[PDB]
């Protein structure tokens, strides 16, 4: 199907406690495959998936250099943004950056990304055209004017259309055993009495990959959206994910409730009911 590659970066200044911490992680779809942490003992880009380990030493050297260099430019930008926002040097601040590409089933570029946040708020973002910018405020407009003069968007467009897509295709082939395998959820429905009049029906989805999934409860075929407790999809820790949906049901009405499971690893969307 469709696939994605993303690089995530966070710098967090810590005045009086050394230089800003820099952590960056790379993903293909929902699979972590590289990491760099400026606080590690001998900081290097490290593999986090088996299909990336075969890349040779010059790969790891180039990725290490880029990460270290991005750590340095974030530290300069943190100082710059203190000026742009008229802020004291005493507080901790955060810079986040994500970039990457989505490709369709044929491997062609669907769209690229490159966007920033300062202290958790949108700062500047490359638009879907990969040629213009959206700046969130007059400070980010200063960066916008800098980046337009240095023609940053052209370099990004060349990367996102070229290397991003091509290396994603390479990774997808090398890790096809896992990256191109969908693991359907194992599903069941539990029943948890609350009082003489009420019980909780909880619909479980376990062990699935990728993370995208739909769990819904229906009552007499009508979606219980407002009365359904839906936990955030969560990592099991073994590459797979978990989720549940729950409704509080009048005792005796259990059979009017159906749980519906959509997942790309399922040929047909599933329907299941509480089975006493």
């Amino acid at each position: 199907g469709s696939h994605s590659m993303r690089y995530f970066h966070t710098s967090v200044s810590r005045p009086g406690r050394g230089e800003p911490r820099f952590i960056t992680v790379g993903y293909v779809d929902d699979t972590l495959f590289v990491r760099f942490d400026s606080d590690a003992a001998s900081p290097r880009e490290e593999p986090r998936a088996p299909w990336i380990e075969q890349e040779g030493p010059e790969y790891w050297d180039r990725e290490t250099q880029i990460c270290k260099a991005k750590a340095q430019t974030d530290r300069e930008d943190l100082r710059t943004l203190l000026r742009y926002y008229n802020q004291s040097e005493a507080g901790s601040h955060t810079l986040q950056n994500m970039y990457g590409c989505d490709v369709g089933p044929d491997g062609r570029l669907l769209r690229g990304y490159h966007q920033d946040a300062y202290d958790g708020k949108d700062y500047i973002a490359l638009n879907e055209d990969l040629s213009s910018w959206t700046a969130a405020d007059t400070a980010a407009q200063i960066t916008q004017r800098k980046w337009e003069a240095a023609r940053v968007a052209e370099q990004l467009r060349a990367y996102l259309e070229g290397e991003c897509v091509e290396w994603l295709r390479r990774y997808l082939e090398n890790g096809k055993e896992t990256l191109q395998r969908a693991d359907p959820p194992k599903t069941h429905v539990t029943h948890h009495p609350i009082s003489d009049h009420e019980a909780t029906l909880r619909c479980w989805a376990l062990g699935f990959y990728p993370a995208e999934i739909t769990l819904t409860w229906q009552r007499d075929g009508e979606d219980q959206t407002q009365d359904t407790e839906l936990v955030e999809t969560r990592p099991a820790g073994d590459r797979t994910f978990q989720k549940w949906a729950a409704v509080v049901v009048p005792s005796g009405e259990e059979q009017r409730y159906t749980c519906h499971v959509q997942h790309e690893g399922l040929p047909k969307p599933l329907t299941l009911r509480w089975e006493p």
Binding site: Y7, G26, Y59, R62, E63, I66, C67, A69, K70, T73, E76, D77, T80, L81, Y99, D116, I124, T143, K146, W147, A150, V152, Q155, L156, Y159, E163, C164, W167
Partner: peptide, 9 residues
């Protein structure tokens, strides 16, 4: 693999 250019803000 990563983007190599290093624009400053």
């Amino acid at each position: 693999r990563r983007f190599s250019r290093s624009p400053i803000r």
